[PDB]
Amino acid sequence: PLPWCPHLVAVCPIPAAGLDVTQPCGDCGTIQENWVCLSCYQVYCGRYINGHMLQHHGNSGHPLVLSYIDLSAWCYYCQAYVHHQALLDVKNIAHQNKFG
Ligand SMILES: O=C(O)CCc1nc2ccccc2s1
Ligand SMILES: [Zn+2]
Ligand SMILES: [Zn+2]
Numbered sequence: 001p002l003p004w005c006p007h008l009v010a011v012c013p014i015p016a017a018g019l020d021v022t023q024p025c026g027d028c029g030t031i032q033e034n035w036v037c038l039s040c041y042q043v044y045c046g047r048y049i050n051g052h053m054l055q056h057h058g059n060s061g062h063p064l065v066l067s068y069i070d071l072s073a074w075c076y077y078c079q080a081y082v083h084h085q086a087l088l089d090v091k092n093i094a095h096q097n098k099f100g
């Protein structure tokens with residue numbers, strides 16, 4: 001995984017409501033393999049379910065998404081996982097919600 005990418009500038013502030021790692025897909029309602037968009041904080045499912053987060057990337061151009069299964073961050077433009085200081089706050093808020 002990359003230690004930086006040129007889309008980190010599109011990571012937006014975390015809503016004051018926080019994250020809900022059990023939130024369903026906003027399109028199909030599945031509870032399985034969802035991701036949260038780090039630009040607009042909508043929640044959509046992964047490629048192995050109904051691919052709604054990939055569709056969101058296509059229709060918005062939003063680059064970076066966070067996995068609610070393992071808290072990895074994927075960039076659709078770079079086609080890589082990214083770790084950076086700029087992702088720690090949102091990873092941490094998710095980790096707290098997920099693990100208690
Ligand atoms: O839409 C999703 O499932 C989330 C982002 C990812 N897409 C790929 C594609 C190939 C390998 C790893 C990943 S993580
Ligand atoms: Zn879905
Ligand atoms: Zn988005």
Ligand SMILES: [Zn+2]
Pocket residue numbers: 005006007008063075076077078079
């Ligand atoms: Zn990138």
